């Protein structure tokens, strides 16, 4: 397992106004000393949650959600991890939410292999036009302005060579379900 890069992807926590904490079964998995980078879609919404992320990994990347208190977070970011250029945006900018053509234009504009967005509180992990799209969902299962019964989720990317293995963690009541999706750069 040496030479892998593990990247946590999460957001739409909405602590403390909608939720008080990540779920206990998620905190049991999210332990220090494993994850190298964190890419957060935003909506923390306060420093308490940022400080929590810093306990998991030193390298924490956040973009500005519509409800974040911290107006210094950037609107969007592009990072390179391994062979992959990765875009990050919270996604309230996309109307209607999750709109494929909108996201595909961002992919082009950012010039990224993988585009990460949030806002919908619905996980996504799929390939379109040989690019990869991720949405980690809401790690706390916070409601959104359209939806009340949200499954908590987060994502972990395992990046090695020209492959990313994307793990999706979902809390179904209080049992965890994991899914794996592989993407290989063309």
């Amino acid at each position: 397992m040496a030479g892998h890069r593990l990247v946590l992807v999460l957001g739409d926590l909405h602590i403390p106004h909608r939720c008080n904490s990540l779920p206990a079964k998620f905190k049991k998995l999210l332990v220090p000393g494993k994850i190298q980078h964190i890419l957060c879609t935003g909506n923390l919404c306060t420093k308490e949650s940022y400080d929590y992320l810093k306990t998991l990994a030193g390298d924490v990347h956040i973009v500005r959600g519509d409800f974040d208190e911290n107006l210094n977070y950037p609107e969007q970011k592009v990072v390179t991890v391994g062979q992959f250029k990765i875009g990050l945006i919270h996604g309230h900018q996309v109307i209607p939410w999750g709109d494929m053509a909108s996201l595909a234009l961002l992919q082009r504009q950012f010039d990224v292999d993988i585009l990460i967005s949030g806002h919908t509180h619905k996980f996504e992990a799929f390939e379109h036009e040989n690019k990869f799209y991720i949405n980690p969902g809401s790690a706390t299962g916070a409601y959104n302005a359209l939806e009340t019964n949200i499954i908590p989720s987060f994502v972990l990317m395992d990046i090695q060579a020209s492959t990313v293995v994307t793990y999706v963690y979902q809390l179904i009541g209080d049992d965890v379900k994991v899914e794996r999706i592989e993407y290989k750069k063309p």
Binding site: M1, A2, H4, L6, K28, L29, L30, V31, G33, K34, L156, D158, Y167, Y169, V176, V178, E179, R180
Partner: peptide, 24 residues
């Protein structure tokens, strides 16, 4: 293929990732 065991955050004894982190 049980992804509860086979994922990088697995806390399962049998997990290869778990084994990897144990070595420190």
């Amino acid at each position: 293929q049980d992804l509860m065991i086979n994922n990088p955050l697995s806390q399962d004894e049998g997990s290869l990732w778990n084994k990897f982190f144990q070595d420190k």
